[PDB]
Amino acid sequence: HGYMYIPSSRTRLGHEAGIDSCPECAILEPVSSWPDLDAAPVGRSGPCGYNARDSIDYNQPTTNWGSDAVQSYSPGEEIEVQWCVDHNGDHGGMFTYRICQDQSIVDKFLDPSYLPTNDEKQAAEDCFDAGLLPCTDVSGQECGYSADCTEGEACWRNDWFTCNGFEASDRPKCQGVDNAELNSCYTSIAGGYTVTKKVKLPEYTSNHTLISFKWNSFQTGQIYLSCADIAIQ
Ligand SMILES: [Zn+2]
Ligand SMILES: [Zn+2]
Ligand SMILES: [Zn+2]
Ligand SMILES: [Zn+2]
Ligand SMILES: [Zn+2]
Ligand SMILES: [Zn+2]
């Protein structure tokens, strides 16, 4: 259980409006999340997530989210990105942030009077995967391989970030990455822990586009998707 925290995602904004119960409960499941990280189709979840506990489709804006950028950045700027993992929901695995460099695809997700179709949700996903923000594009950032993967498997990739080993002796799982304190970010079930990295924004402008976060579970056949509305100008 987890969701994108910084920049503030649609999921975080919905929680701030008080119209949800469980921001960390937005899940693409049951699916094959491992070791092939991109195989599972996103279905209703899309690039922004659907929260089936609270019946909220983050892919469609409201006045609370998706109708404006939450933060404006410059092309190529290195930025902090952070997600929140639930104390009782630390599944380990790998995660990534993506920007779809096709404004016309993204625009389907920016209209509060429009619900993107399942077809549009998957085409957006494929556009996001072409627009993955690699860990390796930030000079000085350590981009390791997963202790739960071996060379030769589809999880052997350091464009994605990795959580620490699920059975790691020291600082296991996702919480191990920042090793922060409990309630360093909000989750509803058992309190949250931050998971923090940097990415380099593409050399690309948009007055309103999306960063899509995807966390692929190691322990469970589950994917967690969120998105944040940004500008790159
Ligand atoms: Zn979970
Ligand atoms: Zn809430
Ligand atoms: Zn994908
Ligand atoms: Zn694949
Ligand atoms: Zn504990
Ligand atoms: Zn286009």
Method of determination used here: X-ray
Reported as half-sphere exposure (CB side, CA atoms, 13 A), residue 200 has a value of 12
Radius of gyration of the chain (CA): 16
- Which two structure tokens, joined as six digits, stand for 176? 């191990």
Q: Where are the beta strands (DSSP E) in 16-162?
A: 50-51, 56-57, 71-73, 78-86, 93-99, 161-162
Q: Does 186 carry a binding-site annotation?
A: no
Count of H-run helices and E-run strands, the chain: 4, 10
Structure tokens at 16: 């701030």
Distance CA 118, CA 128 (A): 15
Beta-sheet pairing, 161-162 with 2-6:
unpaired
Cα(110)–Cα(68) distance, rounded to whole angstroms?
Answer: 8
CB 92 within 8 A of CB 148: yes
Declared resolution, Å:
1.7
Q: How far apart are CA 95 and CA 164, in angstroms?
A: 11
User: For residues 229 and 4, is the Cβ–Cβ distance under 8 A?
Assistant: no
87 labeled part of a ligand binding site: no
Measure the CA–CA gap between 76 and 205, rounded to whole angstroms. Answer: 10
Smallest-distance ligand from the CA of 127: 3
Kindly report the backbone phi and psi dihedral angles of residue 6, in degrees, each rounded to the nearest multiple of 5, phi listed first: -140, 130
Please report, as a single letter, which amino acid is at residue 220.
T
The answer to whether 73 is a known ligand-binding residue is: no
- Pick the ligand that lies closest to the CA of residue 160: 3
Comparing CA positions, the residue from 21, 115, 132, 99 lying closest to residue 62 is 115
Q: How far is the CA of 195 from the centre of ligand 5 (A)?
A: 16
